[PDB]
Amino acid sequence: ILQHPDGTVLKQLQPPPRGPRELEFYNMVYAADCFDGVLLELRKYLPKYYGIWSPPTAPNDLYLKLEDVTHKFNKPCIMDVKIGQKSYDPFASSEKIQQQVSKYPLMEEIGFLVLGMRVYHVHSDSYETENQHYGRSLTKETIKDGVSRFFHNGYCLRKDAVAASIQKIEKILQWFENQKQLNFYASSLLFVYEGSSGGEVEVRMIDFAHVFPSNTIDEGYVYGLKHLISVLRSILDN
Numbered sequence: 001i002l003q004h005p006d007g008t009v010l011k012q013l014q015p016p017p018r019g020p021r022e023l024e025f026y027n028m029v030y031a032a033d034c035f036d037g038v039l040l041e042l043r044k045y046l047p048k049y050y051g052i053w054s055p056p057t058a059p060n061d062l063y064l065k066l067e068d069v070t071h072k073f074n075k076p077c078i079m080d081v082k083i084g085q086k087s088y089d090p091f092a093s094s095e096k097i098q099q100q101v102s103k104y105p106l107m108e109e110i111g112f113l114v115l116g117m118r119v120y121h122v123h124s125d126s127y128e129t130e131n132q133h134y135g136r137s138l139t140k141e142t143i144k145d146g147v148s149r150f151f152h153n154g155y156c157l158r159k160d161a162v163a164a165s166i167q168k169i170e171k172i173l174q175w176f177e178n179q180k181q182l183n184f185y186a187s188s189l190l191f192v193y194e195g196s197s198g199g200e201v202e203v204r205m206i207d208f209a210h211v212f213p214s215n216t217i218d219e220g221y222v223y224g225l226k227h228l229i230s231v232l233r234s235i236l237d238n
């Protein structure tokens with residue numbers, strides 16, 4: 001992810017088949033002639049898509065030009081959460097399944113994994129960050145406190161941002177409960193709130209290298225969303 005001052009990010013296409021698949025996803029959803037109500041509704045929860053982009057001198061180097069979801073914030077607090085019970089897709093080899101499950105064997109049970117967070121603290125005027133090892137260390141016993149960490153500024157627990165997050169996830173959950181044409185693997189929710197304000201949050205779906213046609217509800221994604229909502233709800237009782 002490369003931030004541009006014009007309020008966009010450039011995401012470099014991952015190696016094949018992942019990068020081409022994510023390009024195809026965005027191209028399908030943002031098709032100029034799309035009249036599918038499911039895909040039109042989905043646009044509200046994605047970064048705005050500005051099409052494929054490559055440097056003027058390097059047609060080989062493929063990027064997606066996407067809305068920077070953090071752009072409108074002064075001191076954005078950012079958390080990336082992978083959603084689902086399986087981080088591998090329906091066409092993974094035995095090797096690949098074992099690789100993905102070993103990366104976080106609690107994915108089936110918890111339904112989400114914190115990929116990282118960047119939290120602005122008022123009283124130090126600085127950012128703590130957690131890398132992928134943080135979320136991969138979280139268990140059933142520590143997931144609530146693990147998630148809570150995102151909402152701790154230098155002073156209080158930002159229950160305002162917690163409640164707003166629930167309300168926005170609920171809309172995304174509503175979309176998932178009203179569609180049976182896409183299943184999403186190893187995709188994420190990007191949380192942003194203002195660290196410098198009240199109840200102002202972004203929650204956007206990102207990372208679509210493993211999105212596939214389906215005939216069913218995305219049950220794994222629904223489970224992950226519902227557990228995440230339940231965890232956030234319990235934090236409101238702190």
Ligand SMILES: Cc1cc(C)cc(-c2onc3ccc(-c4nnn[nH]4)cc23)c1
Pocket residue numbers: 001003009011047066067068069070078080190206207208
């Ligand atoms: C400052 C900052 C940090 C982070 C972690 C993410 C972002 C970010 O803002 N808008 C985004 C749209 C898409 C993605 C994306 N798609 N696939 N992978 N990342 C990331 C985005 C911005």
